[PDB]
Design a binder for these strands. Structure first.
Ligand SMILES: NCCC[C@H](N)CC(=O)NCCC[C@H](N)CC(=O)NCCC[C@H](N)CC(=O)N[C@@H]1[C@H](O)[C@@H](OC(N)=O)[C@@H](CO)O[C@H]1NC1=N[C@@H]2C(=O)NC[C@@H](O)[C@H]2N1
Lengths: 82, 207, 86, 79
RNA sequence: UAACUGAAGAGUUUGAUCAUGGCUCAGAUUGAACGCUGGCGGCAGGCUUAACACAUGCAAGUCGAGCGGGGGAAGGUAGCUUGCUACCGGACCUAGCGGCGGACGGGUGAGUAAUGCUUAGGAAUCUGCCUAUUAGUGGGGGACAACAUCUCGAAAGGGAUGCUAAUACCGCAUACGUCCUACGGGAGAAAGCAGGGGAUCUUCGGACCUUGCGCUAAUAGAUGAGCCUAAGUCGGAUUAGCUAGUUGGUGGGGUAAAGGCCUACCAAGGCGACGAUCUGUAGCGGGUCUGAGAGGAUGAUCCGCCACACUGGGACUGAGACACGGCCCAGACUCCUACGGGAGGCAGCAGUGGGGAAUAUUGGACAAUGGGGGGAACCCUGAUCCAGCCAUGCCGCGUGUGUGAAGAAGGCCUUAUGGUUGUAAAGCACUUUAAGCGAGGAGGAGGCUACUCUAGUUAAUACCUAGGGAUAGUGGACGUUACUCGCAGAAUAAGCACCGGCUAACUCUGUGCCAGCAGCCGCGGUAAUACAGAGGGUGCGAGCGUUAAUCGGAUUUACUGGGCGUAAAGCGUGCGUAGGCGGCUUAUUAAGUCGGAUGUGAAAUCCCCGAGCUUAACUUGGGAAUUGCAUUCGAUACUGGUGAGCUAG
């Protein structure tokens, strides 16, 4: 199935996630279809904490992509913020 | 690592006062051996040198006053070359922007070594937080103060009294009563001494 | 096999292999009967053989034994070769 | 909307098939001089209209045989 | 705003000289190794050799809300040696059948010069789970594990007779779509389980209603995969001819699908000097190093594709494999044994032996991100997140600061009294980073459960689903976290190379072509600034040197950018094949050439401006760039094609 999930990057103890649409069988940090935002759980100061492209999110959900629990929570929080 | 040991032979080898002591006693009365290299085969100032010798001797003189080792100095040069402008003045600005040197020019330390020890022992606060790295680059409009426990130090009082004899730079506005100051801008080339030649350094690092 | 589930998979594999082989041999037999009638050359006999063969081909195609494209190909080609007998 | 090539026939012996020689002119990657390169393509020609020496046009298609995947469009010039 | 700005020489042939020409040096870089030495932190990296052989543990399970058996806890009722027995309904567990998963994730680069890879296109395909929509889910039957009995074997495990359930299996019925069709017609499915309940009945225990999870047929979407074409992609001619299913066609077979993919006939074709065939080597790309550039070298760690799984040949199941921890066959090897009979494949993680100059722990947790199963609770996950070891690399920090001269002593030199070590030392006055001890303490955790409210669905206020609210519980392996605050006391913390020229840094002793040094030129045969020690100095600094390797300097294979009278270099001389190049004018074409537009050129990497790490390394937002490729539309000076004309060749 097609999923929308978080791919980990960044440094040790300081993760930085890219929000990617991908086939679920692919490796976590490997091949993906399209990247639609990022999440930074440790952002400080001027650093942005969450950017999500709602248009692409809705477009991919309308075609059968299944967001993970964390990504669904982040999408709800982003919609509430904006 | 930081150089530890005799400073007078270092000043003698380059042939000029390196401002490595407080200054209560002038260089001539302090050393009595100027114009003589530290070695037994040490000679007068008039000894001829190759161009490679002159370029090297200028770079070593520049390094010794600021207390910077070769790796960090080479990184400084590489950054200055990348930044657009005059390479020599860029390098001088980078050297004059170190936190220890700003503390020394604010008169909180009688020598740059004293300023470095003060910075390292967490006696200095930058923009309200206690730091301990001497190589932190100070930017325009910054605020450097003396920590509360650091205050009431006779070394600091003697340092500010000795600094009063020297002329406070134009780019530093310092309140000695509150032990506070503001770095306003990077010094220009004209403010720095003209005895320092940087074309030799640029040639040496660009060969 | 090292794990219990791997052993179970092997056992189920053997049983399913036997069952599918039987079902596939049935389709092959019916197609052979239709071919024999066509080679015989009697139009009515070939038509009867084809009418008997078609339901078996469709039933086994619906079970996944053979692909439905293969079933359609067999039906079409056999019907054409029967029609050739006029 | 379909890729096509123009060439000259160099063989018509095979049944319903022709061999057309395509020529192109490219720059040498290092020395810069313009050179000429040749490729031989087997094409499908249903009615054997093409002969040796004519100038023909062939368009890409699905495979017809092991080596033929191009088909004749028209004969531009005849020998 | 910006995204680039770039090019150095030296030594050595001779009694001088100029040229030619090799050799050598100064630079950058590394998955390095070795020698001497060694305090801390952050972030990375860590068998490059034997695709050699592997002890041991772990790396693929999960579902009782699909199914029948079988276990062991408690409770309640009964009796009575009286707190023991004998019964009965609910809560748990799972060997077997069954479903899904095991084709992912992880490892390695042996094979593979094109069936691979890169770029750009194409038509003749299939696709579980996911999304949307349509039509359904009726009624029967025969079996087989478990189980019971017998038997073989110490067992491990085998064999044989008789039963049994299902969402296991097979007919029959029905068919919006679907398949075939001669356009008349013909053919083909499926399975139940669970939550709640108003009325009604209940042949007595359910029907019925409703809501979910399922199952069948089909069309689109998305995803994944298969197939085809063109152009590129390392040497060798001391490898020149290769090919008969070979090249094409027809009938048939075969595949999910085009196709000599297979087969029977028909024809004699197909490839090759633009390198076929044979042969050596090799995973390919994004990228990495070097270089002014053009080029050269390279393909660890990260990402994409391919191939392989002890060595070869196969197929089964399945949506998907010709399947690392599945099956069959052949081979080599290894292990257990009571000699009856059995077992296995670390190029998964850790580890062992061996090889080697050389590369680590038989660690913790599923808390986070993902993956599998399940309605959920939850279980599994050597992926992953972390920890351990190593100066292997990069970046940062410390090993203290000021004062201190009629210049202590001691050492090295000496013109024998000075010089130097040197403000160096001692003395005097201060400070406490880091390490040590004590106290406090974020973030990585979004959530979930309980309570209450709102809205859908229904007959319903029940159930289910989607939202809101306050409050309370619960949830972290790292971890004695980062970070902050106190205490003690300079207390715990400097080595390595070099000093003839190239190339910064000089003397004295010792030895005498010896011992020795040496990158090149060269030093050493009694005053050696070149060997060894000492003093002094220079360069670096938790590092410093040596060896190895790539590019550069090397215009020393010269495209950019070289030469051939005498330095190396014109074939002994003609003719001529392929090829390269080719006079003047004109019309036309638009292949080369030039311009525009559109699509593409994955992400990461490089560069620029910012952001967050106490700074930096590092992480990260957005740009710029990706110099290319393809399609299409234009221009016609030059080159090419075509037609016509001319005469200086
Ligand atoms: N049949 C598959 C073997 C194929 C292989 N290519 C040939 C092979 O390995 N033959 C050996 C050989 O005959 C002999 O061993 C020695 N060393 O002589 C024997 C001793 O028992 O074992 C066999 N090997 C076996 N492997 C098997 C195993 O594990 N289980 C079952 C049984 O097949 C076992 N026998």
């Amino acid at each position: 199935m097609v999923v929308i999930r978080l791919a980990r990057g960044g440094a040790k103890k300081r993760p930085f996630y890219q929000i990617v649409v991908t086939d679920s069988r692919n490796a976590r940090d490997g091949r993906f279809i399209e990247r639609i935002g990022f999440f930074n759980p440790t952002a400080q100061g001027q650093a942005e904490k969450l950017r999500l492209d709602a248009d692409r999110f809705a477009h991919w959900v309308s075609q059968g992509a299944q967001p993970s629990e964390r990504v669904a929570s982040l999408a709800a929080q982003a919609k509430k913020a904006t | 690592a930081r150089y530890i040991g005799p400073k007078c032979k270092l000043s003698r080898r380059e042939g000029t006062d390196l401002q490595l002591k407080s200054g209560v006693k002038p260089f001539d009365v302090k050393t009595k051996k100027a114009n003589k290299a530290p070695g037994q085969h040490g000679q007068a100032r008039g000894g001829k040198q190759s161009e490679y010798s002159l370029q090297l001797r200028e770079k070593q003189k520049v390094r010794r006053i600021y207390g910077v080792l070769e790796r960090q100095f080479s990184n400084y040069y590489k950054e200055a070359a990348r930044v657009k402008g005059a390479t020599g003045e860029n390098l001088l600005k980078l050297l004059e922007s170190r936190l220890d040197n700003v503390v020394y020019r604010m008169g909180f330390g009688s020598t740059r070594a004293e300023a470095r020890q003060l910075v390292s022992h967490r006696s200095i606060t930058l923009n309200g937080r206690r730091v301990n790295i001497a190589s932190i680059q100070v930017k325009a409009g910054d605020v450097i103060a003396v920590h509360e426990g650091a205050k009431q130090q006779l070394r600091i009082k003697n340092a500010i009294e000795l600094a009063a004899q020297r002329g406070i730079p134009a780019w530093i506005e310092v309140d000695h009563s509150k032990l506070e100051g503001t770095f306003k801008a990077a010094p220009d080339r004209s403010d720095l001494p003209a005895e320092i030649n940087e074309s030799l350094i640029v040639e040496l690092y660009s060969k | 096999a090292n794990s219990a589930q791997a052993k179970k998979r092997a056992r189920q594999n053997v049983k399913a292999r036997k069952h599918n082989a039987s079902l596939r041999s049935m389709v092959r037999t019916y197609i052979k009967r239709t071919l024999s009638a066509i080679a015989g050359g009697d139009y009515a006999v070939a038509t009867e053989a084809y009418k008997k063969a078609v339901p078996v081909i469709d039933r086994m195609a619906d079970k996944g034994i053979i692909h439905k494209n293969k079933a359609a190909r067999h039906k079409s080609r056999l019907n054409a070769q029967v029609k050739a007998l006029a | 909307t379909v890729r096509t090539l123009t060439g000259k026939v160099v063989s018509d012996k095979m049944d319903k098939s022709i061999v057309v020689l395509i020529e192109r002119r490219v720059q040498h990657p290092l020395y810069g001089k313009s050179i000429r390169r040749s490729t031989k393509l087997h094409a499908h020609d249903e009615n054997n209209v093409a002969k040796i020496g004519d100038v023909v046009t062939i368009k890409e298609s699905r495979p017809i045989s092991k080596t033929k995947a191009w088909t004749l469009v028209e004969v531009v010039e005849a020998a």
